[PDB]
């Protein structure tokens, strides 16, 4: 009785009533409850994971001989979680000079991959020359048999995305099932960077090819970084690719799709500053990603909105 | 439980002895092709058909009545009549009953419909 309701735990007139347990009965537990055991939820935090590497790990496997031999050259290149500020010109000079002296293929290529990664972080454009000078001959040209070491490919790809470069499309294509079959070994961050670059450059077709492979190779869709999905989708103006992207959008999860919308509305919105290159206007893809989000969320009832104009009829 | 286009092509080239593909298309006027290894029980007859003895069923439809263990795949234009037929086959208790939605339309590229039903509701 009142506008303030009784709280059923603290009130003995609830607790000890006939619909609950009186204090003179024997007070044991009624039934056991196993909730967590029967059907358990997987852990997904609202906050992203604080320790994760957040980059493209380039996997440095060197024989612990050349690793010691080449130390004064390698000390200038990135080691794990450490990014020395050495100017990229110098590093490339060192590779060009000293590398023909080393005899190992595997070593020369690990070293090269480090150089590429280093040049990806500084966004120096003259590093593809290195690909055409050493690797192109035995990997990409005229159906050469040789199969490049994975780390090298990851590194070059990462470089083509960081420095936006038409070249990526040629490399990526070699990684599908009939080629090197490297695509299932890519990191989630790899996909993230790829999508973002392709999106900036604006290839709907690059975007489609990449989303198809990602899906087939079972990438982690929900953990692909939202910004990069948005920038990729934003690039899609062509009727067919557009169709593809609706049908595809059904592959994300409820949550992912909600934040695809949030992120999208921010990047053309308040957070338009957050990007190094501003987005381009897609009103169509924006509207659609919002629409999709609305379709996939639970629906709420707002009767004064729906039935605002309802009039009954006696027909 | 569903059966997709992939399963359908596979079963065209590589049939299983005790899997039956049963065509539910109702009107003979609309059916010009034959789904490979299929048999014809039109939807309209199903409730009766499934209550025949093995012999009687043989006499009425001219092929052996599937046992209740065997796989039964159902077929129609859109996948609607095949569904309703499925409910019939499931109510007599048949253990494996699969409907192939989009069935004859997807197979042959025909656009036909089992029933004329439209998505739009007439305003109340």
């Amino acid at each position: 009785v009142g506008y303030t309701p009784v709280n059923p735990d603290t009130s003995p007139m609830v607790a000890y009533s006939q619909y609950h347990w009186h204090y003179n009965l024997p007070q044991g537990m009624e039934r056991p409850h196993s909730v967590n055991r029967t059907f358990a939820a997987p852990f997904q935090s609202n906050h992203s994971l604080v320790n994760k590497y957040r980059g493209v790990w380039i996997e440095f496997d060197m024989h612990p001989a050349f690793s010691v031999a080449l130390e004064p050259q390698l000390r200038k290149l990135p080691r794990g979680r450490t990014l020395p500020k050495t100017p990229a010109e110098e590093v490339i000079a060192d590779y060009t000079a000293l590398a023909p002296l080393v005899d190992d293929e595997k070593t020369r290529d690990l070293w090269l991959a480090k150089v590429f990664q280093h040049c990806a972080f500084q966004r120096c454009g003259g590093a593809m020359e290195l690909w055409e000078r050493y690797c192109h001959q035995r990997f990409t040209a005229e159906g050469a048999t040789a199969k490049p070491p994975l780390s090298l490919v990851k590194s070059v790809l990462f470089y083509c995305n960081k420095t936006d470069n038409s070249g990526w499309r040629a490399l990526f294509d070699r990684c599908l099932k009939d080629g090197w079959n490297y695509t299932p070994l890519f990191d989630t961050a790899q996909w993230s960077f790829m999508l973002k670059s392709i999106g900036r450059m604006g290839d709907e077709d690059g975007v489609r090819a990449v989303l198809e492979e990602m899906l087939d190779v079972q990438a982690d869709l929900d953990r692909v970084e939202a910004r990069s999905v948005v920038i990729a989708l934003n690039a899609v103006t062509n009727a067919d690719v557009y169709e593809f992207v609706k049908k595809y959008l059904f592959n994300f999860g409820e949550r992912k799709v909600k934040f695809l919308r949030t992120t999208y509305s921010d990047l053309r919105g308040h957070g338009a500053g957050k990007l190094r290159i501003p987005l381009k206007e897609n009103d169509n893809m924006y509207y659609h990603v919002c629409w999709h989000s609305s379709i996939r969320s639970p629906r709420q009832f707002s009767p004064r909105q729906l039935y605002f104009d309802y009039t009954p009829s006696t027909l | 439980h569903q059966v997709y286009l992939k399963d359908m092509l596979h079963l065209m080239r590589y049939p299983e002895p005790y899997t039956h593909i049963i065509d539910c298309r109702t009107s003979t006027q609309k059916m010009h092709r034959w789904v490979p290894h299929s048999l014809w029980l039109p939807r309209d007859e199903v409730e009766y058909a499934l209550q025949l003895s093995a012999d009687e069923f043989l006499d009425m439809y001219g092929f052996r009545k599937p046992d209740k263990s065997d796989d039964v795949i159902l077929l129609s234009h859109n996948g609607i009549y095949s569904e309703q037929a499925g409910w019939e086959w499931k109510k007599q208790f048949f253990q494996h009953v699969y409907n192939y939605r989009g069935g004859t339309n997807e197979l042959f590229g025909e656009s036909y419909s089992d029933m004329n039903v439209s998505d739009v509701l007439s305003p109340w």
Binding site: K247 | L9, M12, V35, P36, E106, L107, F108, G109, S111
Partner: peptide, 21 residues
Amino acid sequence: YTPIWKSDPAVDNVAPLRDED
């Protein structure tokens, strides 16, 4: 709101197989 996307074209899936055979 349906249909969300354009339905698959009329393509005939049985013909190519039985033709190969």
